[PDB]
């Protein structure tokens with residue numbers, strides 16, 4: 291996600307508003323981030339009780 | 343040459359034992375990384391046309407192939423716990439299904455685009 295973000299950022303001007311492609315990339319980044327954070331949270335409670 | 347090299351590189355994950363999970367995942371994901379990096383570099387050459395050429399189609403098929411290898415290993419690791427009878431012959435099937443499918447793709451692509 292970061293490497294594609296750079297390879298996308300090498301093309302456009304520096305506009306302050308958020309574009310549609312910026313919203314989509316941020317949504318995708320937040321989804322991947324939430325998946326990794328979810329894995330962290332399921333790795334934390336894993337030892338106390340394996341049902342969760 | 344580099345995209346076919348990266349695809350043949352992604353192929354080698356089938357020869358690794360299905361128990362070494364970090365090994366096969368690392369190979370597959372590193373291959374998706376290099377394919378992603380390679381895609382943008384080639385595409386810069388020509389303008390930002392909206393139709394598909396015979397070169398972004400090629401890198402798209404290579405990227406889906408690498409992706410297909412990785413998700414196939416994902417289903418393999420999912421299925422080894424459920425039923426081993428189906429997951430035993432998955433690698434033996436993949437080792438012959440991926441190179442033949444790629445050679446037929448190469449055949450059809452090169453013939454269809456060099457006849458024109």
Ligand SMILES: C=C(C)[C@@H]1[C@H]2OC(=O)[C@@H]1[C@]1(O)C[C@H]3O[C@]34C(=O)O[C@H]2[C@]14C
Pocket residue numbers: 364367368369371372
């Ligand atoms: C799969 C592993 C071990 C990690 C992951 O990221 C890492 O830093 C580890 C590394 O071993 C080294 C680094 O190349 C790696 C990568 O980007 O994917 C993987 C590779 C291979």
